[PDB]
Amino acid sequence: MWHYTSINNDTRVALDPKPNQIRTITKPNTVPQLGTDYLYTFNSQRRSHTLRLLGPFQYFNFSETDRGHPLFRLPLKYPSKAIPADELIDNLHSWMRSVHLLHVRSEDNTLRYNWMLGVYARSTNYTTPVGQLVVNAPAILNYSNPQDAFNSVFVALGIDYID
Amino acid sequence: MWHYTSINNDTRVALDPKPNQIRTITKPNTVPQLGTDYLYTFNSQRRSHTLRLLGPFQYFNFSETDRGHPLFRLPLKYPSKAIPADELIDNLHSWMRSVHLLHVRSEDNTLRYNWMLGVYARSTNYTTPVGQLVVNAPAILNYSNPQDAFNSVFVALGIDYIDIPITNSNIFDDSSTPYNVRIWHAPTMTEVNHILALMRKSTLVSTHSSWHWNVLHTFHYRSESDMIDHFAAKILEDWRQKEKLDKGALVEADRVIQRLIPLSSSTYVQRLAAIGALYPNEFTENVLDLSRLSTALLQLSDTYYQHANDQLRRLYRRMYNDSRTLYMTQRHQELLLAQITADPNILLYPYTYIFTTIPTSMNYISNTGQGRIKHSLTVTGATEHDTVADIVLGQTGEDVITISMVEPMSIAVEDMYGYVLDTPTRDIWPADEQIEQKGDAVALYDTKTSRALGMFNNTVRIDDLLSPLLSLVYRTYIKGDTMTMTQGSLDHLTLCAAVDSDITFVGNRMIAPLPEGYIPKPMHRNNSTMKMLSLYVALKKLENFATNSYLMAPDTSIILLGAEREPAVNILRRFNRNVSNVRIIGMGDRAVEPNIRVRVPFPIDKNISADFIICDINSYEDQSFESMFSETISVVTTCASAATRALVKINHPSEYMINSVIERLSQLGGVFYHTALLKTASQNPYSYETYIYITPIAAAVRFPFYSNSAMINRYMTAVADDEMPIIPSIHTVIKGHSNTYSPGLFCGCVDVQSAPLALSQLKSYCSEATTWRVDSDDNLVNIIARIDPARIALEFRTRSNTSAYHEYQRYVPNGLGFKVRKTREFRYMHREVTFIHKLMMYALIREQISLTENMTQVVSIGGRNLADISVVPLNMKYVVIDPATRIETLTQEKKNIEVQSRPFQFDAANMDLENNSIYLFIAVIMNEPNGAATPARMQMDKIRNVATAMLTRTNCVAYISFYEAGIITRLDQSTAHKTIRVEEGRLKVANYVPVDTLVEADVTLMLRDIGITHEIIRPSTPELIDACSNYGIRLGSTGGAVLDVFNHYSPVIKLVR
Amino acid sequence: PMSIAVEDMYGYVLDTPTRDIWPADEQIEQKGDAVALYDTKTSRALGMFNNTVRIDDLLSPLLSLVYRTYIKGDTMTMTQGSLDHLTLCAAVDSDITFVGNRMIAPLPEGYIPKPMHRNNSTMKMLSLYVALKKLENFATNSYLMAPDTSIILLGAEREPAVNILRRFNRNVSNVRIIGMGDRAVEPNIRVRVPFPIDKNISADFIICDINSYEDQSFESMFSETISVVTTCASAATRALVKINHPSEYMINSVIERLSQLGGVFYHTALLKTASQNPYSYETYIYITPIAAAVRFPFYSNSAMINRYMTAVADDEMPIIPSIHTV
Amino acid sequence: PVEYGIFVQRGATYTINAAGEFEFSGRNEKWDQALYLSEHFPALFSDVPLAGANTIIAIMRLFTPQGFLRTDDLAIAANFPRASRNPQTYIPYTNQRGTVTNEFASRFRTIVATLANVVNERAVQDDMQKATRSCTKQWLRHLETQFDNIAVAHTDHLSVVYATMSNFMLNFTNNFSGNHATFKPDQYVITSPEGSY
Amino acid sequence: TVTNEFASRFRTIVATLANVVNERAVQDDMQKATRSCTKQWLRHLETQFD
Amino acid sequence: PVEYGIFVQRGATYTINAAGEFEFSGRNEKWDQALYLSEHFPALFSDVP
């Protein structure tokens, strides 16, 4: 039982959807569910409200417009009882449906959307140069080799980094 | 059943009331009812409100004044709950009562109101000329001959046509209408011809083969999309109808051909109409997602043309260019001839082309509902692939599919509490044996156990295995769904392990509901928790074995040992809360209160005592073997002296270690303790650690000592491995007929067109391959496919490469499945314990057959579905002798198999055994060929005849697996019975009749009087790890308990010459 | 539409074999009559009635009413494993938990489960599952699987019957309810006849409902259905396999095949369930090994057989019900 | 602000895919009339319902035209040039003679009732004095009476002027199908194979 | 953007201060006219900032 | 941007070898006319697809 044994794989890459699924990654039709779409807990003896999103949305920089949504004003409707699941679900569904990441669906089976950068471009309303890149070339987010997903942006923009 | 048979009748005419009923068709008195007056549905997960009216109102153009009614403002009062039926009914009744179609009641019994035109005149407030006609002559709507109902209006007004808008069938959908119908003056066939000729000059226009009221009418679309949707809809209706006409059913349909004819259109509609008369679809009873129908039907067309033989292709093109023509089968035209002869004045579309011969295209599966398909790929097929190019599989998102390491258990609640126990067998422990056992144990402890073994032991944690189950018991509790269970029951205990709160009962069976606003947190169990609970149950059952309420007697104590045992104590305490005076103490290193903290050896001043003891203390990770020996001996001494009913873990259950434990207890108490080797189902399946039950009894123990025990063998045979353990790969490329593939999977995705190919290449390695698409829009079929070694053993015997590739073609594009929801799959799937056992046998026998020389053939007897084929090396010929197996001769020829579908003859004289052959009687002698169990004496007769027949042959070898009697006495003691259990003394493997078992001493006795050389053997641990790692299989939780006993007591007999 | 009692649809009748031997001189006659029958096909009127009177539509008003009384909460008490339990499971697409032995757990407020979507052959498969439970015992009142036992439905599109049987046996521990057949969707595995040679199905129960291929040589359908019966018989001690063309020759040759397969004759029977379309001549054949040596193993002049044999292709195009006005 | 947040997050515009569903840009951006000839449509006029922005969608439904799509019959009998395969013009409002009440005018009463409750909801949001509110309402009512006066002149007189003018020989194009959501003009060009169209 | 996000943030700030000044005025029974005037002034600030 | 990243990944310039084959730098570097007299050529004008 001496040697270490493990499968290495990039989760931040695995979690990023193929471009065709981006139109429906908001789940426009079906309503969100606990333990799948999201998870929530009201921590008692401390009166706190933790709503963590799951799937690709677990890494998501909100636009200020996203923060203008009722779903974030929700905790304010309390303390102290846990938020009713119906209001939570209706709001979070409404917000989820609100997001519309820029993309261009393609036929190639090797590709995936670079979820981080497109979400980030949404977050700044595509004012930042990476943003306007994402507007004029949504295709730049699709990628086969995981690394070149960023290299294409660093070369198109000439930048040494992106914070 | 050749000829079409049907009654034709005009529904749009039949639905139109006689004039006298128009005053009361609003139903002024009675209130409207669902399924009669109307129907409503609120579609959940989409938040939509469909209210469709029924009866004459199903075709109704609303006045804007009708749209000023509250009934239409109603959906706006929501989202999201369905509209209350009371408000719906009151409003809809009010509206219904609001309508007042103009009419003049008459006495004649032949008449009916022309509902469409009068409704339409109401809709425009009688401003339109047809409207003011309806005002000044209401009588014009009444009619006997259906056609003249419109002719009277066309002549009174002088008009060549009337364009009637149609509303959506749903009335809550106030949006632009897709198109509008247009009644034409006609009435002679000639006028119809002329109109249709002139319609080629219009833009977006189409017609049914025949018309309601026998008045020619054409649809005119706002846009080609709307047109395409109408066409696809009607194509599905004609398909669904001709499907039942071909089946010979009488059909009450309004018209023989429900497909539209595009008098003028975009190309997409032409290709739709073209594919429509081909009738490609197989009959299907599944519900379709109509919302995407057009897309589906277009894609189908695109593939139908894409893989059709050249003549069918050209036929498709012909239909595509001559779109104004109505293509139809000969039987259709026969029906038209009939309905013309009945009604000579009927108008039918005139430009038609009869198929002298129906096209013979492959039928397409076309389910468009949810669900991944689970194909089971056949080894061979009509297609003969040659040098097919490698098929790359695309990477998939976590959103489409995730690949977790181990499939969680899906057992019954009680199932996890069961345990199996191995009794001691040998009556003495000679010192000459002791030196051997002490040596083997020392060397084992020094070199450590198999790396692969420990990798599986650590990867397949039991806590994670039971998590989905315990969490569900938790979740049904907090939402109050649970409420009734016996106190002291296993469901009670598991509820106690699910939830961190006291669980009071009100009365003997009802559980007290939780106070409102209070939701207890999940119990936090560490990995060893469920095991300790399982041991507590194990003690309660060892105490009695007739018990149903596993609950402590009042005023009795139990004391769990080992590190971090606190949760098991809190669970046992909360579980016994209703029992008076129960001590449930905890000890061990790293203990927190309630548990006392201590280290081994226990402090010398300390004096624990209880009616029960459960030691789970771990051996120190780095110490001399003699050190661990004195330590665990001291542990067993403490636990034995402390309680009459100890259960102490042995981390290193060597023959020497356990037997020395028996020696220690024997010199401790004088008379031998009644020891047993328990193994619970809440243990991690691969753990070789085994508990030892210990109790004084008045009877002097006979056969106190162990030897060649199952629990012991599981540890002893896990010798340090020769080669670094295999790691399940996720292969992406699919090479055609290439032997090189490590065990693992094919997870990935590929365009639906390459899908038939990918499945056809996968079959070389994978027994079955689930596939699906995320949606009708996305073109990529995802595929997950385990690599089964058995299929590799079959498909690589010869260079031939064939598949049911066309059958897979039949799926494109809708036949491969659909699923929006995320799917999780596992590197290690669950399979039944018996299967894992068969695999261990096949590994044992494979590893044996590879060593032996000059063996011309392997002959498996009774090997259904070529079950034993993994054993036989790819070059050697493989004979099967089983009545049940069914093969085409060309297939056995394709793979160098040789089936002989006759029962094997067990009579010694006519049993023609070949020299240089390896017979395989794995798991067959116990049963008669029909599946009925043989009496054990008959099995002994079988082995006698096969050894006696083997007595003349040279270089012959035979593997006769058979169940041993000892397992029965163990299974009578054990509570585990998920898949192996006795039935009046005969063990019952799953999906098999229970069978009588042989005694090994008697078998070796007859085998030695016969004089043939022979070796009893069983698969060991390395075979377990090889089978599991190779097949991608993890052992079940209950499987972990039962497998050592089940495997040890199912010996293979290796006869040899 | 039918107006029967809830239990009434689960009943079946079975014709036992009568003749003790199967002479080859008889075999030529039966093989001839069967071949000619399969070639000329059955009566057009017969098939028109068979297709017009679908059982699904016949039972629709009933199943929908069991659904409707459930959603408005009018139902609440029934035995688990009872026919009313099963029919409730076929009426509603949702899990049906019991609180206590007889009370059914009321649905959570604001939640109305959708109707179960049964295809035409669903109720029949449920009827066959009941048929097997009753053939196993016949004193049974709770038609429910024993714990740790498996059943494997075959044939195209059998998924609803599997979801219904599963939801019906939800309270029973360790029940495998597998499905197979062509055009199968998950949970059901998809396969085509002949089954892949590597495949090895096995269960305590088997129910084949596989259709004969629509256009093939008679010898082709013969080898196909024989292979089907062989698979189903080897797979399980208690098979129930459909015979689409139940000629005297076809069924008797099935008995011959099982007889050369297992040595001793299987205890075959010719079942016909009430959930079948009324005019269907397709008939199920129960198959089981028994310790007793069967006497009169073979059929002749049987009722289920006669229903098919006598549906010879008709002389005259079938009558269509007119609606006279004068 | 909130309904606007939702709406413009859906997209400022939309296009119609061959499936005929509207697909919104998902992006804020001002319209320019260049786009009028493109595949793009302003999204206020989609009439595709959107949860949480119902008030905007309703105020938008007020813009839907009250007329109908007349065929150009007399310009066809005259063989007057017409670019469309089936020439048509949208008359703004139908004639309405028999009714006690003019349906066009009544539609204006509903529009105005809506705007009235809208302006009111604003005034209460901004604590506006009762007098000025009553004055806005009196002004709206006055508009209703005025529209009720002229409505007959529009529907029952001006419409016929439109209906003749549709058949004038040079009014050769199709202008409007009457559905704002999906109407783009047919676009002809004079393409030389040599130079640009 | 069609809309300036900085300006819109000022609209939210001002909406808040508006409901604040309002809650005060109702606490102090302030005349409707003066309240409408404070609101008109706040709106004007919003347009100016925009 | 995307075609540009591909092209520039190939190299902003190239040299011709004795066999006549093109040989791209693999590097993005700004051109200077100092290079006109050197072996290097701007890669935009290579006309190699």
Side-chain angles (χ1 to χ4, degrees), chain A residues 137-150:
Chain A
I140 215 183
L141 299 169
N142 326 334
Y143 68 85
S144 52
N145 184 268
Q147 179 179 46
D148 300 329
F150 287 77

Side-chain angles (χ1 to χ4, degrees), chain C residues 244-277:
Chain C
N244 306 270
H245 306 81
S247 96
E248 292 168 338
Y249 168 76
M250 182 75 265
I251 297 182
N252 279 305
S253 59
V254 160
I255 310 308
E256 185 175 4
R257 187 66 178 94
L258 304 173
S259 69
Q260 66 203 11
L261 181 64
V264 68
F265 292 88
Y266 286 74
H267 178 272
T268 53
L270 290 183
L271 190 147
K272 225 174 179 303
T273 221
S275 287
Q276 291 184 10
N277 324 271

Side-chain angles (χ1 to χ4, degrees), chain B residues 150-392:
Chain B
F150 287 77
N151 288 343
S152 53
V153 167
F154 292 145
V155 303
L157 255 31
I159 63 198
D160 303 271
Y161 59 92
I162 289 179
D163 309 276
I164 301 292
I166 95 285
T167 55
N168 309 286
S169 68
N170 172 328
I171 78 180
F172 280 154
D173 184 31
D174 188 29
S175 72
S176 65
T177 76
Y179 57 91
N180 76 328
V181 80
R182 171 188 288 188
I183 344 285
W184 280 88
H185 183 33
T188 344
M189 195 52 229
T190 58
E191 321 232 1
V192 174
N193 281 104
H194 173 83
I195 285 167
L196 300 186
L198 267 290
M199 239 45 209
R200 298 161 179 248
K201 301 304 202 174
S202 30
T203 309
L204 295 169
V205 49
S206 63
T207 30
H208 287 126
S209 65
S210 101
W211 311 269
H212 316 274
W213 310 280
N214 190 22
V215 196
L216 144 71
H217 56 84
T218 86
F219 308 102
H220 298 273
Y221 305 97
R222 305 295 151 257
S223 71
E224 79 287 344
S225 79
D226 300 320
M227 176 174 212
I228 279 173
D229 282 277
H230 196 204
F231 257 83
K234 261 51 196 57
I235 282 170
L236 192 53
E237 288 182 2
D238 186 31
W239 275 357
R240 187 179 315 284
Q241 175 205 343
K242 142 122 163 57
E243 266 179 7
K244 65 198 56 172
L245 268 176
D246 290 323
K247 285 161 49 189
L250 186 64
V251 185
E252 67 285 348
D254 309 339
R255 53 181 142 261
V256 183
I257 305 279
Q258 290 206 359
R259 288 176 290 109
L260 271 322
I261 287 98
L263 311 174
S264 206
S265 66
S266 66
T267 195
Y268 282 5
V269 129
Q270 285 167 277
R271 76 187 40 171
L272 262 196
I275 212 217
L278 300 172
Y279 298 90
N281 260 19
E282 191 167 340
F283 168 80
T284 168
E285 66 280 0
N286 284 322
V287 203
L288 298 206
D289 72 321
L290 279 307
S291 50
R292 303 313 303 269
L293 225 202
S294 316
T295 298
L297 284 196
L298 285 177
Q299 285 174 330
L300 210 181
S301 169
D302 290 21
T303 75
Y304 187 106
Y305 185 76
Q306 197 167 344
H307 57 264
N309 52 92
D310 179 85
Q311 64 108 338
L312 230 176
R313 238 198 184 93
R314 107 158 42 82
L315 185 269
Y316 173 97
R317 269 169 287 164
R318 285 174 44 205
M319 307 185 45
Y320 165 85
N321 298 336
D322 300 28
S323 58
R324 328 283 225 278
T325 304
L326 172 68
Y327 291 80
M328 81 195 323
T329 83
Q330 223 299 318
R331 309 205 280 257
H332 279 144
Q333 195 261 9
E334 186 65 27
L335 263 193
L336 291 190
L337 247 287
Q339 109 177 103
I340 275 182
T341 287
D343 188 30
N345 290 331
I346 210 174
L347 302 171
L348 301 179
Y349 194 82
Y351 316 132
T352 62
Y353 175 88
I354 321 307
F355 291 113
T356 311
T357 164
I358 189 166
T360 333
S361 70
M362 48 194 82
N363 284 133
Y364 294 79
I365 306 295
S366 201
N367 178 26
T368 179
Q370 302 295 298
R372 312 169 308 163
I373 305 306
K374 270 183 52 58
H375 311 257
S376 80
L377 310 326
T378 170
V379 203
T380 53
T383 299
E384 284 180 4
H385 300 281
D386 48 275
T387 71
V388 281
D390 303 337
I391 298 98
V392 193

Side-chain angles (χ1 to χ4, degrees), chain B residues 703-883:
Chain B
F703 319 101
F705 295 91
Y706 299 85
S707 174
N708 209 27
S709 181
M711 274 72 178
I712 308 186
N713 279 343
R714 157 107 134 211
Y715 168 55
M716 298 301 299
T717 64
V719 213
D721 126 271
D722 48 330
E723 45 179 3
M724 222 62 173
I726 33 183
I727 296 173
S729 316
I730 306 177
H731 314 293
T732 36
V733 278
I734 315 171
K735 299 176 183 60
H737 197 270
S738 180
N739 198 17
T740 165
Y741 270 112
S742 106
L745 288 111
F746 282 94
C747 175
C749 63
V750 59
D751 182 32
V752 278
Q753 309 308 148
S754 324
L757 218 181
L759 293 168
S760 61
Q761 290 321 295
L762 240 44
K763 54 92 193 177
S764 298
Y765 331 104
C766 312
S767 199
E768 50 179 5
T770 151
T771 84
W772 71 105
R773 308 166 68 188
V774 137
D775 199 333
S776 301
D777 304 89
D778 173 42
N779 58 85
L780 310 156
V781 153
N782 326 284
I783 310 181
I784 333 168
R786 189 93 37 177
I787 288 189
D788 67 310
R791 173 54 55 78
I792 281 181
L794 219 185
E795 212 268 348
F796 285 97
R797 318 196 79 251
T798 68
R799 293 194 67 263
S800 160
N801 173 23
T802 51
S803 73
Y805 168 74
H806 52 287
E807 292 297 330
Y808 301 159
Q809 279 178 317
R810 290 168 71 264
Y811 306 150
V812 177
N814 314 291
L816 308 99
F818 285 112
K819 196 181 183 182
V820 286
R821 305 178 66 260
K822 168 218 303 290
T823 127
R824 60 160 57 262
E825 259 64 36
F826 314 96
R827 305 182 180 278
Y828 297 103
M829 64 174 179
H830 166 56
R831 301 290 272 96
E832 339 91 28
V833 193
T834 81
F835 182 62
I836 288 177
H837 176 54
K838 297 304 294 302
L839 292 184
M840 293 171 59
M841 280 186 164
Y842 294 161
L844 189 257
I845 305 187
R846 174 209 307 119
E847 287 287 344
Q848 292 224 357
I849 286 185
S850 61
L851 296 178
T852 175
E853 284 167 344
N854 308 126
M855 315 252 49
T856 61
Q857 65 181 345
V858 159
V859 189
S860 63
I861 279 69
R864 313 199 313 263
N865 307 340
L866 319 176
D868 305 29
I869 199 181
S870 57
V871 170
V872 34
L874 303 181
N875 60 277
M876 283 175 18
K877 45 187 275 71
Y878 174 55
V879 173
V880 202
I881 302 183
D882 52 346

Side-chain angles (χ1 to χ4, degrees), chain A residues 89-128:
Chain A
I89 264 174
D90 199 335
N91 277 333
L92 165 61
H93 177 77
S94 187
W95 171 78
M96 224 166 199
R97 285 206 52 199
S98 167
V99 343
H100 289 95
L101 309 186
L102 259 58
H103 66 274
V104 38
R105 336 169 74 264
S106 54
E107 302 168 358
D108 32 24
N109 72 320
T110 49
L111 295 200
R112 6 169 58 113
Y113 183 72
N114 178 27
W115 168 277
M116 162 183 274
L117 253 49
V119 146
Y120 173 71
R122 173 200 157 82
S123 89
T124 58
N125 305 83
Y126 314 93
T127 69
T128 315

Side-chain angles (χ1 to χ4, degrees), chain D residues 4 28-29 125-127 129, chain E residues 2-3 33 35-36 39 43:
Chain D
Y4 169 79
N28 196 6
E29 49 172 8
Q125 183 190 2
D126 298 35
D127 301 271
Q129 273 200 352
Chain E
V2 176
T3 302
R35 305 154 56 166
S36 83
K39 253 82 176 299
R43 292 296 183 195

